[PDB]
Each structure stands twice: as C-alpha cells, then as structure tokens.
Amino acid sequence: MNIFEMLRIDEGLRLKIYKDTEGYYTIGIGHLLTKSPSINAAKSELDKAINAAKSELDKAIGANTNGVITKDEAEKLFNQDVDAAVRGILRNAKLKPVYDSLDAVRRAALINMVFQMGETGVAGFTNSLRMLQQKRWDEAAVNLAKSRWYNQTPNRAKRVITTFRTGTWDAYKNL
Template sequence: MHYDEQRYAQQSPYTPTIPSLINVACEFIAAEEGFRDTPYHCSEGYPTIGYGQRIGKKNQSLTNFKFTLPEPAARAWLKHGIIQRLNELDSYSSLAAVFMEQNIPRQVVLLSMAYQLGVKGLSLFKNMLASLSIGDYVMAAEHALDSRWAKQTPERAQHHAHILQTGKLDGTGGVMDGQKN
C-alpha cells in the first residue's frame, strides 16, 4: 500500500508536522542504526545493509550479496521503511490509536521500535502501550525496559525509554522538544 499523507494527516493531531515526523524519524533511526554500504550480519544473524535493512534470510551467507549500496539509496530505503511502518499501523487499530495520541518524539520512538521489531513486534508491548494510552510515561518507560528487546539492545532501549518518559528528543532543540508532553 502506498503511504497516503493526506489520509494520515486528516487523522493526526500533528497535521502540519507529518513530513517532519517522517524526516525526524529518518534522522533518528539513521543515527541509531548507523550506515554500512556493504552487507553484514545483524545481531540476530540476518544479512543487512544500509541503515539496518534486512536483505536475506537468517544466517544466509554474505557471499550471496556482492554489491555496495550508496548512502542516498540507503536513505531512500530507510524513508520507505518508515512509511511502510506507518501504513502497517492501520492493521493494528489499538496500536494506531495509541500512536496518534503521542507527541512527535514518542511517535519517533514507536516508529524506531517498529522499524527494528516490525509493527507486529511493537504491538506485543501491551503494557508499555497501555501505559502510553493513559499518559503514564514513567511506567511506559519501565515496561519498555522489561523486555527481551531491551536485553538485546540495552543502549537503544535505555535511550528510547528516556524519550518515552520525557517526551523529548535529545539534541533536536526547538519545535520537537516543546510539543505536547
């Protein structure tokens, strides 16, 4: 399904900032993932390239992937992946409802988690999502850290939990830091 910005914007309390959401999420995830122009195995054993883009089956040999990926192409894949996750949210109505209620920094964290774990994987964080839905950001952060994901990627999980709790992206300044806590 192609991302329909107008449809999403009509549903979002952040109508003027939808392009900003995608751009901020792209920068955030790019910084988290880091860029690699040649294939490598991610921590879970999947052939990966660019900004954490899976390109093969688990434990598949990297000899099957003899190419380099230019950074602009990797950035386009990343943006496409974010848009794809936004589209997939429609399949999970309760997750989509929680997502729509959050400020942009928290939405960026949820998109980052969906990028890493898939939207289905994100939907399994039921306690975290329930806490977000009632505005209990301290508990949301605690629930995010009480997971296999947090054990596998502890620094990322700590950073995400901090943003879930504070509602602020570190180092973004200006408009993102001051929006709807």
C-alpha cells in the first residue's frame, strides 16, 4: 500500500464526468472540475455548468474530450493531483510541521485528507493537527470524527482516521 493505491481506493475511477457528494463535477480518480448548480437551478444553468466542467476537463487534458477520458489520462491527472497535494502541504505553514513530524503511513493519511478537502480545509483542523503532532493518536481520532468531513463521508473518514490512529494500512487491506 502507498498513497496512490490508498487514494485509488477512496476516490475510485470513473471515465466519464460525474457529480460527487459535495455537488462537484468530477472525473477520473477524484479530479475535481467545477461546482454544479442546484437540483432546481434552471434548465439552462444546468447545461452551462456541464459545458463549464467539460471546458475545465479539456483544458486539463489538452484535448477535446467531451467529458470522457481514458484510464491513462485519469492516471495522468491523478499523478499531477497527488503531487500538487504534497506540494501544498509542504508550502503550508500549519501542515508542514505536522507532516514532517509523522511517519510514512500517517503522512499518507494527511495527504489523503488534503487531496479530498484541499490544503486550507485541512489546515483548519487546528486541534486535530496539534494532537497528531503530539502523537496523541486516540485523541486525534476522536477529534477528527467531530466534523462535517466525517458526517458526509464516514466510511472513508473512518479509514483515514484509523490510519492516523494505528500507523498501519489495516483499514485498506482487502480493499
């Protein structure tokens, strides 16, 4: 197991644009494109938002994709996105010290969170980050669960939290 295999499990692989639970048009392995409108929001708005997502996809791929990509293309966006997530952690004054303090498995758990919620979002878990830096694993696990993050994607959150708790890949075995 490594960060790529871990995120591949949590994000899945879809070759056509889809909407994730947070209302974002997404494709590949968790590659976010743009935000979608309301289930109501006009018949027009809907189509505009769809083309806006396709526009973002084409720009990212450098081709006229019409919302469909190949596995190789999804993996290319994925490599870029993982690198970007790590790069962001390293450039963030709050995340870097925690990241540097962690072992390799726990570092993957933090990259996973950043990949899902973005750098500023994770930098906001001030109390959990402190508990992680103090190696207070169980307390960090309890604090991390008291979040919209956990309530919205509990099964994934539980795997990430278990990884921080144990420092092992147990939550991802048989997956």
